[PDB]
Design a protein around this ligand. Structure first.
Ligand SMILES: CC(=O)N[C@H]1[C@H]([C@H](O)[C@H](O)CO)O[C@@](O[C@@H]2[C@@H](O)[C@H](O)O[C@H](CO)[C@@H]2O)(C(=O)O)C[C@@H]1O
Ligand SMILES: CC(=O)N[C@H]1[C@H]([C@H](O)[C@H](O)CO)O[C@@](O[C@@H]2[C@@H](O)[C@H](O)O[C@H](CO)[C@@H]2O)(C(=O)O)C[C@@H]1O
Ligand SMILES: CC(=O)N[C@H]1[C@H]([C@H](O)[C@H](O)CO)O[C@@](O[C@@H]2[C@@H](O)[C@H](O)O[C@H](CO)[C@@H]2O)(C(=O)O)C[C@@H]1O
Ligand SMILES: *[C@@H]1O[C@H](CO)[C@@H](O)[C@H](O)[C@H]1NC(C)=O
Ligand SMILES: *[C@@H]1O[C@H](CO)[C@@H](O)[C@H](O)[C@H]1NC(C)=O
Ligand SMILES: *[C@@H]1O[C@H](CO)[C@@H](O)[C@H](O)[C@H]1NC(C)=O
Lengths: 164, 321, 164, 164, 321, 321
């Protein structure tokens, strides 16, 4: 966790969640369960899809290798030929491998980011009306019904409420 | 009382990927962008079928090795396959001028139409049917290249030849000819009477004059004699003029180039598969949407981009544990 | 927002602020208004200026293309020539485009970083004496005059004060 | 500080700490002193070691330059030769320099990350039982003995305790 | 009561830029680093003006095409402009040996000084004023190249020539000569009496012997005859020796190379603009501080670095909404 | 009461490194990955010692410049060192055909074994001991190349030579010969009687016929005469056949190639250091574990990867203040 969210303060991942990358599990009186944030999950889809097609597009004219043959007294330009074709094939092979390693890391950190920013979206609503447990969960100083939560997920959450 | 939690996906995928700082890191979803599979076959490229010389080189094909009749008349092709070490090359020993340059032209042509530009019949004052070796056997009997013709003396006489020829087609002609280099002075008179000879050849562009080199050489295919071949490209409406008094292996069939286009000469040991592809390498064909492959750098058709790695996996999902 | 500050928890940007990249808006009894943090804004100027001139410097010897002509029987080396000059021009064109895309992202995230770190500079001063609103603002448990703020911006802020 | 920890909210570094990259200084009744987190410090060792050997491995077949000589009427291919060998040597020299600059930054930010994530590991334990000072330190609402701390560092810390 | 807020800039700029993960992302400040504008003109490069052959090739210039007198005497140049397909090349048909290599030398020279090294007057025992064709017309009348001279027989006699020549300057000479290849034996005697001829030429380095190839060829510019040109570089203090008994197109003017330096041969259809630049491409000149351009790869002068993209914008500000 | 703090390392290192956004940034630990130090010496590469021609070129070595006896017999070598401008090249003026191609072969050989393939004694009907110049002096007395032999007439007679030679070894022979180009007809008869001569040479592959060019040339090393050298590679079990009636500089010693392998021709002014390395450049050797170096692009042995930078430092630790 570069952002410290994923495998950082939240422990594992939610096997149960089969609806998006990130979301919630709630533990209330009408029911329990999982939901996924369209806002953030959809934004991430758009993210990596754009990453992929820009990687593919960045290397779509690359280097073609035509066959030239040389005779017996042309070992110098034949070598020149060989080592230039080889040489290009090598820098393009490097570029692909390098670009991949980098974008992989920056992508993992991207998902991590999305988590910590979701956790902050909720935390920046329930300020007083819940306590930060420490493992990514909020315990309620009130009672929170299914419909209270729908107000939460879509982030319009009613703060006009006491505390103690 | 109630809590509410925030968390992410984990699942049952075993698929590691690599970052700059850590290797073999398991994740949820992962995309593969490297194609590592061919069909081990030589296919048609979009329905137009390759020229696969079998044990022939380009030289035996073009010149007419009598071991090369499979290719007397060759349809439009998509790309050519030559073996590393074709057995049927120059059956009468010698050389073929500017050979790699002509192989380079061939990588830019998809169709020749062989046409006869000087009939074997047209030779009134020389013999044109006794020009044959044991080094070029056709079915046991002494033969020789089909596309050129090894003229020799008649009635103890090689009167000087003047043959002109005007390309009146819409296409460039590939035209081949040669000179025969005898083994000794005795051979030279036995074959052409006149002890001292030449072959001059001119177009708009080509102005050469060849004299044969009589000389003792090691034996190749039984012979110390050599044959040396030359070629040119005749422009539509230009003429080629030949004048010689011996040692002249005259053309008989030339090639019209009726389809320039994108082609390749592939070195491969393989043989005709009987399939169709949009992308061919010399170790087999590729059917893949992948943007990369690591099969072989020389490639023809709509092709993934060659890369030397044996593993490229792109992370889509997140960390899994 | 990779750091979740810009377009994350703060909503928009301050059209009114015409003095630096980041800063403050205050809503007190002697006046209201905007100020910009020299410390952080200046540090960012130094940032991207250095980025630009290192990009320019990294590609200042690149690849020049001299003209060579070949005749009619030199189609092989003429092609070799062509595809090597082309090929270089292609890897250098890739490098420029790639380097740009990457540095653009890492730069946007840089500005975001600077914001969240400013918000933390203030928050790590007003601990008790204000409440985090949720949209990047602090409501005061005391009265804060123009001069109190000058102590804030320059970050020397006097905590020796009660609370309730 | 991209993550705002190093040289951000913590001021300097701990000259005294000679045991790892990151850790603690405690100011209690049985003694005072420094400790370093095996968990995080070791994880960082593994980090940059992997970075180094992947940089070295990514450029281990590169471009060799064989000597070819040309005569006096071969100035065109001699130039071609020269500018291709030069040209490769230039893109590989760029790649090394570029890759280094990038990985240096991403590495500094890596260490910063590790700090802020350590600070969060502790903070997410001492919730009530300490106050965030502001310069990376926690003042205790109880008494914390050497053994209390060993519970802290290894992060199993007993929260079952009052507050006021 | 009081609040205090923290926030960033937004403004009225519409200028999107691209990241690895999102396209067309609007921002506050953005810098452009790609230059996409030329002046469509051929300029002087820092006050020294180009050589623009107009409908001449290098060969017609250097050899003296009588359609090429604009360039009889050419000042120091900064770079040369040749059209794709110059109309005034070799007016008498033939070839120019090592032509691309000489064009390659030219890309490294900025100034020639033509000097006369063998006067047309100096030829006592041959005619030197009747060596002219209709294929090289000057104002309707049969002319010929100015820099070389087509010697022929006088009083039915071509005595063998021995002309030596010693380069006593501080500079290398570019020296050109040629051989004439007749159409037939009749032509050869009409022109030079002796049926069998040669031209030998030696320096410290060059040791050649040329024999003309008599031969029937297609007509070009009216002729089946050919002229073949050769060139050399004379080192300061070395001599060039010529000995021939016919078919010898002798030099008359040579070139001192008095300014080697950095130049280029540009293929362009354009003509002299009347301006000044520090950076020139063949489609126009560039005045820009930008570190990149996408105009054309071949470039001369203090130049932005060529790149194939049509858009490079670097983010300076932050996100705007 | 108690506090507890969290913090990081700082120390007494002064070592700055660079990022994309800031320069000269001091840190705790830093690793250097660029090697900038050589030993200024030419070493053995893993115990096998270089061939350092001193003031000899490859041509003087291979042909036997009598100023080049240091290298009459040269052991297996690891790589070759030639000076920029060796003083002992062709002492009798002329040229050496396909010279850079033969230097290219040499970069792929580690050992020759000189063997005598035609004894100077074996020449019964020509003189083979009077073929010597002042341009090739050995200890003041007129000498000549050792590996070839300049045959001339005997008893006013150069009967036509037919020497054949069959390579019966397991290795390719490098075989050198030449032709002598006289200054005038008088010289040609003085030396070989017959006014009109040739040298034909054939193998399985080579079919040449050389005629000498008599001609006046500038003086080099005192002479206007030239010597022109040719070489070939004889395949195991093939023969080389020579027939000539004058101007023939016959071979006497040839080279077996008994160790092909990886080598290089280094241009360097340096001389034998007396050391050992695993990696050599022409300005000295490198002993380093570093993955990069910035010394010189041409390199042989187990080598760090060349790079043009003068500074590459990788950050290991963190920021220090
Ligand atoms: C056109 C012709 O004369 N054909 C001959 C041929 C030629 O005379 C000869 O190759 C010169 O070009 O000679 C032929 O016969 C013999 C071969 O049977 C054998 O391989 O080798 C023999 C001695 O070297 C001899 O040449 C031939 O090559 O076919 C007979 C043919 O009619
Ligand atoms: C130097 C000389 O003799 N000049 C002749 C010229 C040559 O004899 C000829 O080109 C051989 O090199 O012949 C000239 O005249 C005719 C042309 O008027 C016409 O284009 O073609 C004719 C037949 O082919 C014929 O050659 C010429 O080319 O100018 C007359 C000139 O005096
Ligand atoms: C093999 C032979 O005849 N050697 C002669 C030599 C040749 O005849 C000549 O180089 C033709 O290839 O001529 C020698 O003598 C003179 C030199 O002493 C001097 O440098 O130049 C002289 C005039 O040009 C003359 O050639 C020689 O080069 O050694 C004498 C030698 O026996
Ligand atoms: C060939 O024939 C065409 C058409 O009949 C004619 O105009 C042309 O001049 C001829 N080409 C040559 C070079 O003889
Ligand atoms: C040319 O002239 C110079 C100076 O007069 C003289 O020394 C030199 O030897 C001559 N060059 C040749 C090659 O004849
Ligand atoms: C050379 O000698 C070998 C072995 O004695 C023999 O078989 C071979 O044919 C000869 N090579 C030539 C080309 O004469």
């Amino acid at each position: 966790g570069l952002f410290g969210a994923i495998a950082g303060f939240i422990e594992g991942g939610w096997q149960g969640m089969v609806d998006g990358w990130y979301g919630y599990h709630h533990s209330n009186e009408q029911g329990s369960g999982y939901a996924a944030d369209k806002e953030s999950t959809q934004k991430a889809i758009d993210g990596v899809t754009n990453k992929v097609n820009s990687i593919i597009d960045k290397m779509n004219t690359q280097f073609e290798a035509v066959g030239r043959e040389f005779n017996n007294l042309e070992r110098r330009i034949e070598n020149l030929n060989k080592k230039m074709e080889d040489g290009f094939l090598d820098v393009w092979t490097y570029n692909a491998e390098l670009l991949v390693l980098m974008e992989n890391e920056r992508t993992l950190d991207f998902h991590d980011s999305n988590v910590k920013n979701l956790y902050d979206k909720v935390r920046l609503q329930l300020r007083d009306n819940a306590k930060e447990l420490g493992n990514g969960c909020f315990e309620f100083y009130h009672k929170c019904d299914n419909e209270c939560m729908e107000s939460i997920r879509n982030g319009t959450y009613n703060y006009p409420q006491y505390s103690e | 009382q109630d809590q509410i939690c925030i968390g992410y996906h984990a699942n049952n995928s075993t698929e590691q990927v690599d970052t700059i700082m850590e290797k073999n890191v398991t994740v949820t979803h992962a995309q593969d962008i490297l194609e590592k599979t061919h069909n081990g076959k030589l296919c048609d490229l979009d329905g137009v079928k390759p020229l696969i010389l079998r044990d022939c080189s380009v030289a035996g094909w073009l010149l007419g090795n009598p071991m090369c009749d499979e290719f007397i008349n060759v349809p439009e092709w998509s790309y050519i396959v030559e073996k590393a070490n074709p057995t049927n090359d120059l059956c009468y020993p010698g050389s073929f001028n500017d050979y790699e340059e002509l192989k380079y032209l061939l990588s830019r042509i998809n169709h020749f139409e062989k046409i006869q530009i000087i009939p074997k019949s047209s030779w009134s004052d020389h013999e044109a049917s006794s020009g044959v070796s044991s080094a070029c056997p056709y079915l046991g009997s002494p033969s020789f290249f089909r596309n050129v013709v090894w003229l020799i003396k008649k009635n103890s006489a090689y009167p000087t030849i003047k043959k002109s020829y005007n390309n009146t087609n819409q296409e460039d002609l590939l035209v081949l000819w040669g000179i025969h280099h005898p083994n000794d002075a005795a051979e030279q008179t036995r074959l052409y009477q006149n002890p001292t000879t030449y072959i001059s050849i001119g177009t708009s562009t080509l102005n050469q004059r060849l004299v044969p080199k009589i000389a003792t050489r090691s034996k190749v295919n039984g012979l110390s004699s050599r044959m040396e071949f030359f070629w040119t490209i005749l422009k539509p409406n230009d003429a080629i003029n030949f004048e010689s008094n011996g040692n002249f292996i005259a053309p008989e069939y030339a090639y019209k180039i009726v389809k320039k286009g994108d082609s390749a000469i592939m070195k491969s040991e393989l043989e005709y598969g009987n399939c169709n592809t949009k992308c061919q390498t010399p170790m087999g064909a590729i059917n893949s949407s992948m943007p990369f492959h690591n099969i072989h750098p020389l490639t023809i058709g709509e092709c993934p981009k060659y890369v030397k790695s044996n593993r490229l996996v792109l992370a889509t999902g997140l960390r899994n544990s």
